[PDB]
Symmetry: C3
Subunit: 288 residues, 3 copies
């Protein structure tokens, strides 16, 4: 909760509204290599985190990090290309700042994407995992974006997370994947957040396996938590960018961004899939 | 350890001694809905955390948070109605400040209570679990109230916790419950501390189960740790306010305070039980 | 990463170079009771963390903490007697500061030692465990020395840890132990870092067991992580100073430093073993 004040969020939201003709319904957070979704926008309007009032700037990426407003397959959007991570030194109340303002912008849904490691054996690099649940490791210890005094204007003190990833949207995505006639099916599993920049050891990969994680990553969870606090509908996917060596074996899949079509294609498929899913996100106009 | 200085504790203890005629032997920390224990006090003297010198004030509850000195079933007490939690933004050295001063007040025993979720299947809401052990999740990562330079005037650098919950007092409570002729028996199990305001997900509830936790909560453990550091006898109970859905099922037991007699009665029974147990806490006068 | 700046490291390294005629190839970090290794140095030159420019001073130990440059069995060394721990209040970027400067000193290898508790049943106090892997509990939550913006001059953003403990050096130590004709064999297993000054409870010791930890301690891991970031060859051992009671049993092995020959001898054997291993650390001169 800390760091910002309610008026901070209000001021940042008003600046945006007074600077963009766009009134977003959907907010989309792009993971690594997934930033290309911005190219699918019509009537796009770009914003530098930098020029937006209380918006945290990027530590190094910067240009990789910007806010784009536009239209994606029927929905008014605002995509965040280049998300914040706590390993970059960002306290969780900064990492989630966007979501809080997106809420005060009118966004009622948040689709989140992230690149992850494959813990579940059946996954194979290139795969896309529809996120059904999560294990918040940083949270178990105090690293929860909601730590601090709660603001009832945003939500409750003890919000439930057992129902964060929308079942309706999850069944809708499951159907849509079938509808597309996709060869390999849409995977679905538990995501485990782990901070720190460095990569896991076989010993650690095995405890995550034990804990029941299907994919491991260093983001998403905080943003999802505050989104739910605001009452926003939340759903997302994880792009498996490498299988995880859980057995004392020779290293492999070191790089993930420079992997040719292995990345390119897989990222490409998720980005379009997400666009098609815009037709499945309930219009605020109570469409039936 | 950080934040306060030894003289801070001494100054706060002396202020209390010079402001209350009471010389407490027992300190009792009330969990949620368990604050009614204060009504069982004779010759009660109320203090606002606010007016006590270095005492951390409440973020919002405030009035729910106050220090009451009195007499409970034969013992001189000081009950803390409305405890501090780290999810409220309190660093652990503030959350435990009370215990440290209680020590310099003469308190040689600390009974702690907390409301928790039922992880062990056999538990049923309303149940009371005698705490036999704990799993300190925030501590495994650095969140231990003792982090910082150790003060030998309070205790050692590496205090043992494998024996925090008194076996004598635990057998005494086990007997007393029988003595009362209580229908359902006194449950006993491991408590798992988890920070953060939000509630667990099925995925997370399952790892706690795996870890061997019988009840989950967001407090108690830090206070217990510093109490042991001071050498105080420690024992407590957990009031199961809801069973935990560890299987992909529809939500339930959202509310806990507004649950009619479900809360009322169960809280009522624990409060009296604790009073009866005052007769079991060893008098400093080496009674035999 | 935080706290210091690159020039801070450069300035501290230059001060050392301009104050010592020694040009260390190997850096050795001594655990508890293992500080006697300093006595095996020839042409030793002592430094007080205190007098070295940005070097964090000791909270209490102080005199137990000093930097000694000398020669050990063929290698130019710099031993750190009295390491920093996060439970002492040191942020991880201070705990690892040494390693970062050791790198800018020319050190291409780091041998780390620590005293630990025995989780694996087959271990028996006195035993020495060659570290093959680790489980970074503080890291899973944000406590990773690399948190903050990454410096490419030291290393990458996402360094791999699945290969931190050198297999070559691990097989070399395995051979050397045999070569010595040692009675009991060299143990090898996973080390689990746990912060906080206090000791584990049976409940907690059982989760570590479940997690697959063979030894538990409150150090080593951070130093290893930054060493790898710098690209240094890393290897180390853990001296089992007490078996861990993972079953509800009477306490035992409280003390570890005051345990007569139990400590003395075991520490003695590890210290010499480490010296013999100097002959196994690859000379920068591409010896073949």
């Amino acid at each position: 909760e800390n760091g910002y004040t309610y008026e901070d969020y209000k001021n940042t939201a008003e600046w945006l509204l007074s600077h963009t003709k766009h009134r977003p319904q959907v907010a989309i957070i792009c993971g690594s290599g997934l930033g290309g979704l911005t190219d699918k926008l019509t009537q796009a309007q770009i914003f530098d985190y930098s020029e937006i009032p209380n918006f945290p700037r990027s530590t190094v990426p910067g240009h990789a990090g910007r806010l784009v407003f536009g239209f994606l397959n029927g929905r008014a959007c605002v995509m965040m290309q280049g998300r914040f991570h706590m390993y970059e030194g960002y306290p969780l109340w900064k990492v989630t700042f966007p979501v809080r303002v997106f809420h005060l912008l009118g966004v009622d849904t948040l689709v989140v994407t992230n690149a992850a490691g494959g813990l579940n054996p059946k996954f194979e690099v290139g795969d896309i995992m529809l996120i059904r649940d999560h294990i918040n490791l940083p949270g178990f210890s105090g690293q929860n974006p909601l730590r601090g005094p709660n603001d009832e204007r945003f939500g409750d003190r003890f919000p439930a997370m057992s129902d964060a990833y929308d079942r309706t949207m999850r069944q809708r995505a499951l159907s849509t994947w079938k509808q597309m006639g996709e060869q390999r099916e849409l995977q679905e599993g538990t995501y485990v957040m782990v901070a720190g920049p460095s990569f896991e050891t076989v010993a650690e990969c095995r405890v995550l396996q034990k804990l029941g994680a299907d994919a491991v990553g260093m983001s998403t969870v905080p943003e999802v938590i505050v989104a739910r606090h605001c009452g926003l509908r939340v759903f997302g996917f994880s792009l498996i960018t490498n299988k995880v060596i859980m057995d004392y074996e020779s290293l492999e899949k070191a790089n993930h961004e420079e992997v040719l079509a292995a990345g390119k294609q897989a990222a490409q498929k998720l980005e379009q899939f997400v666009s098609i899913l815009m037709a499945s996100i309930p219009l605020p106009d109570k469409a039936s």
